[PDB]
């Protein structure tokens, strides 16, 4: 009933329930930045600091998911994630950091992706638990 | 054609699915049927099968002085030849001509097959009571609280000794858990269930019994072997009665029991039962005694010397083994019948791990909110 | 025929199960029964296994000098032979003729076998010696001191080798504790300090008594020895009354008084009880004295020499030991004769934890009430 | 007297130790000796325990149809009876008269008992399942990630509960590994995958052979079955030659070929070798076929029926099993039938260590060659 | 007374320190001497002690038909009464009048006493080879070096994985040590050395033997008991010869052996040897058989009925037990003859701990110097 | 004679110790503040320091009291818990309910709080007693 | 041969072989201070800092020795140390910190005491090891 | 097929890895310094930084080389040890034996040192090989 795949599902669930909130915070910070002297400069820079800071966690979570579902023989779900790998590579090439449209659009798309992956992981885990 | 008296013991002789629309020798089926077919092909005769009225094989009575069953049918001309599991015995060899054994067998052991491998989700808590687990949890949180207080109001000699006493505490706790777990695993490991009869004589937890009417107890009685002597002593002074009536009950009472009862019966019947639903039995201990089944025939007959040769020919050609496989294993409804730690023993650990991880993520998110909002914006 | 007079005391003179329907010698069974059978086989004669009337072995009246018991039946013609557990004494041999002892025995100690004692508040220290525990504590505090002496006495290559050696040390200590605790909890060897009567005499915690009416009591009264004299001093000046009036009474007292009572009785009866139910007794030490049961016969007789030779013949043949193993061990019921860890085993750990915690807390409070006081007033 | 012709094959016809000085039947000893003794006791006659000349059991020439062996001595008057392990066959029964089998047996597999195998580079993972190991690794890295996500994603009440649950987890994991490893190293249960001939047929790693001259080989040639046909296919197309020319040769091959050779032979000889020196063999599985050794006697005789009844009388009395236990098990030499931990058991640990170390080192080097490059060029 | 023939067997009859300046009954000393003194006081006679010429007790020869030893001296008037360890036997009771047993005894076991409790200083390294210990040390220092390099040149992803692999490494190492140590301790714990004869029949590591001339093997022979039957089978098929010549050699060969050999002898002699230097023997197993020693006298005598009474009187008064204590225990030269871990098993741990502590103090002092001097002053 | 309640009670009174100590220290602090209510700067520094400490000594109260309640819950002790709940209710009220006037109210609060905590310490001692030997 | 007292002896030995050097450093620092503007003030104060700092170690070592030889049933040696306990108490009362004479004299006396206690501990340990 | 030498050799070449890396980095540093030998301040800062790193990269050399020698000693490897001792002798000599002239000498030293360390890396690899299968 466990098969070590339910564990990866649980982990990814706990780990993406943070990314949904992270992306919601991205969206709200974009809404706040929509207002585009020293006061506003600070209100923008102190937030863009955290914005640029909390990018490595995405790499971490995604490499973790990939590795787990790779050595866990969970092949179906890996294909659902490798395109995001190619996207992250094309972003590391050079990120568009003219700058708000792509930001908000990628945030929306990634939020939808994570919100759907949460449900998909819960689904696969509920199926793997009652497989007996 | 030639009369052939037999008996309705499975799987030797059995009826078809619908024995109402069937007539003649085509009604029956079983090992003995193909055996008789081969004997006919060898000696070249047409035969008619019959069933014994008394449903018995044969034996005398201290007063009647008359052989009953198929042996009686053979003695008193009621049948010209018997093809059935007619055990060979001294008393019977003095009145008929047993052929050479077409099946050698003996007494065996039968037990409830072991398949109990469903460990609880939180079995890892069994080594020591849950009381200690709760005490451990609350001691951990209390020590954390004390360290927090100390390091907060007096920013040492207190931290050092709380650390030392916690070192002692965990040193003893991990070891108290590990040692009891090792005891559990070891005691569960060095339990040789059974491999022979002596494995039962030198123990009394797994009781065992025989039938209340048969040559099994007779073999156990008037026996010199100290093992069987002790076993007869046990079964005779047993309470409740290890002995039982017809085999079906002795089988069911071990089917229900987990590992407490064993039934000593005929090895062949044990193998047959092992290949029938619900497939919860097994035979491992080698046969104790050594006997055989043979094709009988009236003493003053002409087929004895023409039947022994056929039996030996079929035994050498391997036809008898073929038929035994056909009617015990091929026809078997049970075709299928570790040391490491399966995850099932440790699942709860990972369950609580992920629970704590999710709780920590929740706490961190709400703290991030209550901090950033209230400080920067609110 | 011969008048074989005996007495009812198992496992010597036992009534068969179906004794109400049977009327003869087949009713009786036991050791003395087969003994008399073999005695007759040796000599050759007919015997009627009668029973004594008053149900006593043998003694005399101090006033009327009348010999009651089997002694009277032999001396006064009421019987011809007494195949019974008749103890050999100076007075009896002065009037009748005893055979050579067919069963040597003596007084022995019976105690309930060691049950799992109360865990012990500080039982978790048993796996390791005590000096080891003290050495561990002091190594810990000394290492703490040294680590403190490389931060103020110097600003590392000292906290590295120290860390490594401390790692090694604590590793081996954890392992040595876990291994020995596992050894303790796996096999659970039981041993009591009572391996003889000397131990009973030295200590005074567990008591002991004897049947107030019997040669056993008078033996302790008699036979002044540095050990038994002390035991008589004890049992004469000791409350409550340790003595009893019957055997089963003393056995039940031993049982319900599991760890503070022992019973002194014939070794044969003790071995007999040790094999019967509930298998909660055991004989310890060795026979304190040496007595022997022997056949009896009137002074002027003819079977005297014949039976005296038959007894030795059987003793040399190994038949007496055979009958003994039959009626004591083969008949024996006790032929055969893991757990979780409750808090009672490790309560001392939590006691020590809370103690050190409160101590650290007091230290922190008195340190704060000085630090803040000095920072405020100065 | 009677001419009891036999043949020298232990433990049936053995020469006594002091046979050079003795001249008669007292020289011989074994199973068949006591067997003939009891046969005479039953019937009553004098016998001269002679021996066959050519040292063969029995067969015929395809051209001269001359019956060599004890078969010839019985048919050609040279002998009156053959109490020897004479296998019963169709051809022999066509010329002489066999008694009922006094010893049932069959072909069986002999293999050297499981010796301590090579440890295994990654044997230290056996105490725990594999999925458990993967789950442990990934729980570790996930906890690391989470701890990383409460320092940059937030500045604790998250590093506290996480620390506690991780403490619990690693505690239980250490304990579950230690306990199972101790269970493994304490008892050391041995089991081989060869529990039948089916297993031998499936795999092809360990080989097997048979005495190139004997009924065993022809049995595999004959008796086409899905299993034995495959074994004949193997042994016919397989190099080097698995067959041998004698028994002791095959036994020595099994011994020196400890883990890649099995021998198929009579179960009686196998049980005999299993009890002799050096106690480095064991019989596995069950008899593949069913044969029986039986007394022989010329076609027209008088002892035929008498001996045929005596054999069954003994089989029912339990005397044949007694003589067997005497000359196979009581005479048995193998009545009876901790270590440190070498590096070979845990080499994988050091391999993994050095691997991870070099990996971390490469990572650090490529991180430095980027950090310094960016700080210099930019 | 009155002639008194005896024998020079210790401690029954022994000479004084200087038997050159001594004459008469005052020359000898021992149990038998005080026994004869008491018998004289009882019957009121003056006696003269003598020693048997042949140094033997008594027995017939298949040809001479003459009793030898003290039995012969009694038969042929050479002595009027015998006071010595003259065992009671059927053949001897037919020619003399044995008194009642003044000492009941039998056959016992003797073994090398266990006192080996000298563990090596560094015994804690035995669980796993020293190879692994060196590898562990150097792995520790290598990991420390790698961490130092990483944290120095690149002030992460490398520290994290080195920490994880070190976690794995130590997890497996502490457990590999603990489990093997637990196996050692357990296997050493559940070894029941011996408690009876059956404890020897069911094992073959500790050999055992008897004397080459005596009634001991005779009792072992012609015995029904399966235990003694198996023991005779073992001793008869033993190699080298378990049997031995005069008791002194059988004693010395177990004195030298550690636990491999046992000597079955007379219980009384075993108790005597147990109370003599070098005090390296013990008797634990209860007596197997049951025999006794008695005061003999010619058949047609007048002291038999006057000697049996005295023997019984002294047995009841407790004088015989007094003399036995006097000559076995009071005269004994050996008046004296755990589960936890003694420090001796762990001493090396503390040795190396203090070595490392001192090395660290030295390093810290020299670093303090080389730092303060060179920085501030030099 | 442990039943998870002896440990709970002893570990709870160990904390009630510093609880009483902090109550008495708050008593003394408010006493000196009410008595006091270059010299001006000294008084300002002193009151700043004391209020800093007070702020530092708030969270432990809530922490250890919530711990008491949670432990009494997990130990099925349904009499001590009911005695401690009102204090938790009062804390939850204090969150959204709260120099010259504030000082006296805080003094009264601390006095009653000390009384209650001393009473609870003695009750827990007696409970550990008649639960450790029964 | 060990008896847990040899361990206390070894520990005190390793622990006083540091005090001998500490007292030698005290003596040498006193010799340097014998020279009694800003340069000298610093050369004096930076050393008196360590001087006043390394006083708690004395309390630690001495309490350790006392406790060890107390619960170790080593009664003879405890009497050889309790007078130093009374001295430390009289010093904690008020230390004379006019100031150099007492300092150097106590340093000399304590150095001799520790140098003799080293030999005494080695003696007792060598006797306790070969007691068998 | 372990004999304490496979672990030693693999753990030693793992260190020789960064040893070679640091030798090559010193090569590159001295190359850029010799090529270079506001702009003045930039060069001063660069040379200060590089020499700071150099100073930081000295102790590991001695540490890991002494470790190699000690391990080869404790492993009874008497051929590798003799090949490494001369370098330790040279270090002990360097302690009391040592911009324009110093740079070239250090360049030559680092070149020969890289050559020796690469040779030793390959020798240790081959030794682990023919000691792991024998």
Tab-separated table of C-alpha atoms in Angstrom, chain D residues 1 70 83 102 128 139 144 207 218 272 283 314 331 339 345 360 371:
chain	number	residue	atom	x	y	z
D	1	UNK	CA	20.786	-75.204	5.556
D	70	UNK	CA	22.152	-62.939	-7.619
D	83	UNK	CA	18.252	-61.117	1.245
D	102	UNK	CA	10.590	-54.176	2.942
D	128	UNK	CA	16.190	-3.491	5.890
D	139	UNK	CA	13.198	11.848	3.750
D	144	UNK	CA	17.118	19.303	4.420
D	207	UNK	CA	25.025	-28.409	-12.263
D	218	UNK	CA	17.904	-44.670	-18.002
D	272	UNK	CA	23.691	-43.125	4.758
D	283	UNK	CA	19.457	-34.727	1.081
D	314	UNK	CA	7.917	-57.097	10.439
D	331	UNK	CA	25.152	-45.565	14.306
D	339	UNK	CA	32.293	-14.714	14.762
D	345	UNK	CA	30.669	-7.094	5.182
D	360	UNK	CA	31.204	17.066	-2.658
D	371	UNK	CA	32.817	32.319	-7.343
